[PDB]
């Protein structure tokens, strides 16, 4: 899903940058139960920064 | 003795494309 999205015209590269220089390239959002299942299943990829 | 214009008129640019251009700069990343 994250690869299939394309780019945009007016993208600001100085906005929504996290610590350690990495760049946020989108946002996914779901309900609380699906989020809890993804958190409890993929805890080896989810950090808190 | 009638009073014709001296030379041709010179065109003016309206001050409304200024607030069009600033509103289009607001969509872009930054004015400065």
């Amino acid at each position: 899903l994250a690869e299939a999205a394309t780019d945009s015209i007016l993208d600001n590269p100085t906005t929504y940058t996290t610590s350690s220089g990495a760049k946020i390239s989108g946002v996914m959002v779901s309900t609380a139960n699906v989020m809890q299942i993804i958190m409890s299943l993929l805890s080896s990829h989810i950090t808190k920064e | 003795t009638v009073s014709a214009p001296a030379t041709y008129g010179n065109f003016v640019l309206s001050p409304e494309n200024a607030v069009t251009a600033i509103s289009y700069h607001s969509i872009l990343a930054d004015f400065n």
């Binding site: 007016l10 | 494309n17 289009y24 700069h25 872009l28």
Partner: peptide
């Protein structure tokens, strides 16, 4: 007028 009608940054966009 240069910064006003044509824009801030000449790269990745222009005002035509």
């Amino acid at each position: 007028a240069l910064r006003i009608y044509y824009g801030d940054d000449p790269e990745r966009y222009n005002i035509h």
